[PDB]
PDB file of all heavy atoms in Angstrom:
ATOM      1  N   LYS C 619      59.773  -9.714 -61.104  1.00  5.62           N
ATOM      2  CA  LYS C 619      61.129  -8.968 -61.242  1.00  5.62           C
ATOM      3  C   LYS C 619      62.046  -9.650 -60.498  1.00  5.62           C
ATOM      4  O   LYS C 619      61.884 -10.020 -59.238  1.00  5.62           O
ATOM      5  CB  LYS C 619      60.996  -7.520 -60.635  1.00  5.62           C
ATOM      6  CG  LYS C 619      62.257  -6.621 -61.051  1.00  5.62           C
ATOM      7  CD  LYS C 619      62.148  -5.254 -60.607  1.00  5.62           C
ATOM      8  CE  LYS C 619      62.618  -5.090 -59.261  1.00  5.62           C
ATOM      9  NZ  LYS C 619      64.112  -5.417 -58.915  1.00  5.62           N
ATOM     10  N   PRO C 621      64.965 -10.063 -58.322  1.00  2.00           N
ATOM     11  CA  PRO C 621      65.555  -9.233 -57.238  1.00  2.00           C
ATOM     12  C   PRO C 621      66.924  -8.748 -57.632  1.00  2.00           C
ATOM     13  O   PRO C 621      67.745  -9.334 -58.178  1.00  2.00           O
ATOM     14  CB  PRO C 621      65.636 -10.121 -56.010  1.00  2.00           C
ATOM     15  CG  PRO C 621      64.460 -10.945 -56.130  1.00  2.00           C
ATOM     16  CD  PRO C 621      64.536 -11.422 -57.598  1.00  2.00           C
ATOM     17  N   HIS C 622      67.094  -7.427 -57.285  1.00  2.00           N
ATOM     18  CA  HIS C 622      68.292  -6.670 -57.556  1.00  2.00           C
ATOM     19  C   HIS C 622      69.413  -7.191 -56.583  1.00  2.00           C
ATOM     20  O   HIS C 622      69.528  -6.496 -55.608  1.00  2.00           O
ATOM     21  CB  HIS C 622      68.102  -5.231 -57.536  1.00  2.00           C
ATOM     22  CG  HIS C 622      69.201  -4.266 -57.804  1.00  2.00           C
ATOM     23  ND1 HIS C 622      70.102  -3.904 -56.875  1.00  2.00           N
ATOM     24  CD2 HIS C 622      69.686  -3.892 -59.036  1.00  2.00           C
ATOM     25  CE1 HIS C 622      71.039  -3.138 -57.474  1.00  2.00           C
ATOM     26  NE2 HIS C 622      70.849  -3.194 -58.828  1.00  2.00           N
ATOM     27  N   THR C 623      70.005  -8.286 -56.913  1.00  2.00           N
ATOM     28  CA  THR C 623      70.990  -8.825 -55.925  1.00  2.00           C
ATOM     29  C   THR C 623      72.249  -9.294 -56.738  1.00  2.00           C
ATOM     30  O   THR C 623      72.266  -9.409 -58.041  1.00  2.00           O
ATOM     31  CB  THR C 623      70.494  -9.965 -55.170  1.00  2.00           C
ATOM     32  OG1 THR C 623      70.109 -11.021 -56.048  1.00  2.00           O
ATOM     33  CG2 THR C 623      69.248  -9.443 -54.244  1.00  2.00           C
ATOM     34  N   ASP C 624      73.361  -9.573 -56.008  1.00  2.00           N
ATOM     35  CA  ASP C 624      74.550 -10.118 -56.530  1.00  2.00           C
ATOM     36  C   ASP C 624      74.344 -11.546 -57.149  1.00  2.00           C
ATOM     37  O   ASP C 624      74.829 -11.857 -58.219  1.00  2.00           O
ATOM     38  CB  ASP C 624      75.755 -10.080 -55.605  1.00  2.00           C
ATOM     39  CG  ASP C 624      76.088  -8.783 -55.086  1.00  2.00           C
ATOM     40  OD1 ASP C 624      76.018  -7.776 -55.826  1.00  2.00           O
ATOM     41  OD2 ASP C 624      76.514  -8.556 -53.873  1.00  2.00           O
TER      42      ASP C 624
HETATM   43 MG1   MG D   6      69.929  -4.339 -55.078  1.00 50.02          MG
END
Side-chain angles (χ1 to χ4, degrees):
Chain C
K619 189 178 85 63
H622 183 266
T623 61
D624 297 325

